[PDB]
Design a protein around this ligand. Structure first.
Ligand SMILES: [Zn+2]
Ligand SMILES: [Zn+2]
Lengths: 398, 399
C-alpha cells in the first residue's frame, strides 16, 4: 500500500487469452485492479507511461536453457554464479524474465559443486529470475542419449531415489528433472521427486505409451522437447507423443510438453499437430547452448564439445543435434509463423504454460490482478521493445 | 407423392442434433414450409421415432467385398455378388458405397468394371456410387496386401497406360495411386478432368510430393497411416497433408481411416481428428471375409487367412483389410476419440459425400437431398435403414 502506483496507457494487454485495449496498473511489483484501487483506496496513478499502442504480455519463462553467451551451466567453474548472472542479464533482451538453468548429463562431482551455487533468485535489474535447476539426465536411455555422453549415464536399479540423491547431491535448488521412465524403479523415483515438489519430465527415452502413462500416474507432468530424443509416433505404437491424446491419464490434469521452435528440431507439421492435438500443454523452450548470442564456433555442452555449423548446433564431429542457438523471442515468432496460431497462443506457450507447469500461474505467466508485473513490450510482429520485472524497466531496445 | 413425417426424433442437421421432425416426399427430404404453398399441409403418414436419432445413411467409399463376395474376381455373376453385399450392408447402416477392386491383372478390370455400374439404392441394397480402383499404380515398398506381380507404372504413356490397364472408366469414381510414380502429375490431371476422384495411398511420397499431387487434383488419402510413411518431425509424408498450409485455398483434403480397432490405435484416430476433423472419412476397407470370420478367404489374387479376428495374407503377418462393418467402425471411432455423436456420424456420411461432390443429394438431411437415413439409439446402434424415404431394413419389430 506504501508503494508507487504505475499506469501503463495506450497499450494492448494479454489478459484471459485475449489482447485487450486496456491499461496495465502496477504497485509494489504486482498488477492492480484499477477499479478496486479507486473504489477502495481512492488512489490514482502516481506515474503514467504511454506505450505507443504496443502490446504488453507476461514475460517469457524458459524452463530448458543450458547456457548462453559463452556460459555453460554444466561446468564446475571458479565462478558459477557469475555465469548464471550473465545469462540472466542477457536474456532480458529476449523477453525472458524467469528461467531454469539446465544441466546435462555430468559426473556427480560436477553436480555436487554446481547445484548449490545456483539457487532460486528473484528477477530484477540484475537479470531474469532463477526459478530453480532443470537437471536433464543422467537417468536417461542410452538409445536416445542424443548429445548426452554415454560414459556418464546412470540407472536406478540399485537403490532408486538414493542413487539419484548421491548423484545430484542435495536437491534444494532443483525444480525439474528429466528422466527416461523405462528405467527400472522409475516409479519410486518419480514419487520421491514429486513429493518434494520437483517436476518430473519424461525425455531421452525409448518408453512406449503405456510406460509413459504409468509415469504420469506416478506424478510426471512434463515431456522434454517432444519428438526429439524419443521414438516417433506410430499408429500402433504411439510412444511418448501419444501422451498428448491419451484418455488414460488422470482426468482434468494437464500434461505439459516442451517444443524447440528453432526451425531445426521440429518441422512446421510437428508444431501444428501438437498445438492442434493439445494446445494447453505446449511449452516453448529454447534448449539454448553456450553459442546463444554468439552464432558460431566451438563450444561445450557439459562433457561434450559442440560445433555450430551454419545455424545448427551439433556435437563436434557428428550430425547429432546438440541444442539450439535461437533465443526465446525468435522461437515465439517462429512458432507463430509455422503454426498460423494466434498471437495470444504463441505468447501463452512461452509464459502462461510454463508458469502453469511449475505451479506459478498466480504470480508469473499472466497479467492477472495480483500477479507479478513481469512483462514485455512488443510490436505487432512480436519483437521485444522493452522488458519489465516487478514493474521496473530492466531492458530497452536501442 | 405421399408425405412422410418422422416425429419425436432428433435429426442430424447442420452439425447438430436438433429435436425437429423430418419430412419426406418423393424420395427426398422435404421442407415442411413448402406444404404451405400446396393444398395439403398435413403428412399422409406420421412415424413416431421414440426419441431416437435420424442421421444420413452411411457412405462407404472403400470396401473390397464381403460375406464371401470378392469384387476383384471375374466371376460369372459379378453383379449378383455386388447386390448381395449391397443388400447385407443395409443392416450396417450403409445406403451408398463404392465397390473397391485391388491390384489385379488388366484382364480382371476389363471384365469386372463394366459389370459394376452406378446404381441407385433401394430395397435390393445400398446404392453403388461407382468403383474405387485401389492400385495397381502404387509403390512396391508400400504394396501391403497387393501382389507385387501385378503392380504397374505410368512412365510409358501415362494416362493411356492407365486406360489400357483398367479399360473404359465410365463406372469409375475413385482411383488410389502413389504420386511418387513418374508422370503421376499427368495421370492425376487427366483423371480429375474426367470427374474421377484421385486418392493418394500405398506410397512413400514425401510431403512435397503429396502437396504437388493435391495441386494436380488429388482430393483424398487412402486409409491414413496404413501403407504410407509415418508422421515425422523432419518430413511428415502424406500424413502431413492434414497440417499443410501449402494446399489450394479452400480445399479440404479428405482422408480415410479404418476404425476397426486393429488398423490404427486410438491415438492415431485422435491425433488426425484433432488436426483436421473436417476431412475425416470412415471407411471399412472390408474384405470378402467380412461376416464369415476365421478361416481361408481371398482378396483379389491373394489368399487371406483370418486368425483371431485379424486378416492377414495367407502365410504372412501382412494386414489384408478389415472384417469390421461400418456401424462397428462408427461406434469404435466414437468411443476411441471421445468425439461428439455428430462428428462420428458426419465422418461416416457427410464427409464422404463432400469428397465425391454429392453433398446436395447424399450425406445430409438438408432439404432436397435424397431421403437416405438411419434410425439410431444413443449408442449409435442402427435400428432401421431408409433409402428414398422407404424402410429397407429394421433390426427387429419389437416396438
Ligand atoms: Zn535433451
Ligand atoms: Zn489399401
Amino acid at each position: 500500500a506504501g508503494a508507487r502506483v504505475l499506469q501503463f496507457t495506450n497499450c494492448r494487454i494479454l489478459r484471459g487469452g485475449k489482447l485487450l485495449r486496456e491499461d496495465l496498473w502496477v504497485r509494489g511489483g504486482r498488477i492492480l485492479d484499477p477499479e478496486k484501487l479507486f473504489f477502495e483506496e481512492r488512489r490514482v496513478a502516481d506515474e503514467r507511461r504511454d506505450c505507443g499502442g504496443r502490446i504488453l504480455a507476461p514475460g517469457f519463462i524458459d524452463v530448458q536453457i543450458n547456457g548462453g553467451f559463452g556460459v555453460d551451466f554444466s561446468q564446475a567453474t571458479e565462478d558459477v554464479g557469475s555465469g548464471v548472472a550473465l545469462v540472466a542479464r542477457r536474456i532480458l533482451s529476449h523477453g525472458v524474465t524467469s528461467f531454469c538453468p539446465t544441466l546435462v548429463t555430468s559426473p556427480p562431482e560436477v553436480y555436487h559443486k554446481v547445484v548449490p551455487q545456483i539457487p532460486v533468485k528473484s528477477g530484477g535489474p540484475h537479470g531474469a529470475g532463477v526459478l530453480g535447476l532443470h537437471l536433464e539426465g543422467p537417468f536417461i536411455s542410452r538409445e536416445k542419449r542424443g548429445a548426452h555422453p554415454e560414459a556418464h549415464l546412470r540407472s536406478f536399479e540399485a537403490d532408486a531415489f538414493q542413487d539419484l540423491l548421491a548423484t545430484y547431491g542435495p536437491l534444494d535448488n532443483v525444480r525439474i528433472v528429466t528422466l527416461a521412465p523405462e528405467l527400472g524403479r522409475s516409479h519410486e523415483v518419480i514419487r520421491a521427486l514429486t513429493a518434494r515438489g520437483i517436476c518430473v519430465s519424461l525425455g531421452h527415452s525409448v518408453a512406449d505409451l503405456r510406460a509413459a502413462e504409468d509415469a504420469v500416474w506416478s506424478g510426471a507432468t512434463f515431456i522434454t522437447h517432444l519428438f526429439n530424443a524419443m521414438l516417433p509416433f506410430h499408429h500402433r505404437d504411439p510412444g511418448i507423443v501419444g501422451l498428448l491424446t491419451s484418455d488414460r491419464l488422470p482426468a482434468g490434469r494437464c500434461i505439459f510438453y516442451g517444443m524447440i521452435a528453432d526451425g531445426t528440431h521440429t518441422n512446421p507439421a510437428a508444431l501444428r499437430i501438437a498445438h492442434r492435438a493439445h494446445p494447453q500443454g505446449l511449452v516453448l523452450v529454447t534448449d539454448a547452448i553456450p553459442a546463444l548470442g554468439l552464432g558460431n564456433g566451438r563450444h561445450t555442452l557439459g562433457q561434450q564439445e559442440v560445433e555450430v555449423d551454419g545455424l545448427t548446433a551439433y556435437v563436434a564431429g557428428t550430425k547429432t543435434l546438440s541444442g539450439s542457438i535461437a533465443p526465446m523471442d525468435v522461437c515465439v515468432r517462429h512458432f507463430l509463423q509455422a503454426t498460423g496460431c494466434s498471437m495470444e497462443s504463441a505468447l501463452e506457450a512461452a509464459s502462461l504454460h510454463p508458469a502453469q507447469l511449475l505451479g506459478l500461474e498466480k504470480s508469473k505467466g499472466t497479467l492477472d490482478f495480483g500477479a507479478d508485473a513481469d512483462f514485455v513490450v512488443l510490436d505487432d510482429s512480436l519483437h521485444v521493445q522493452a522488458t519489465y520485472i516487478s514493474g521496473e524497466l530492466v531492458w530497452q531496445a536501442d
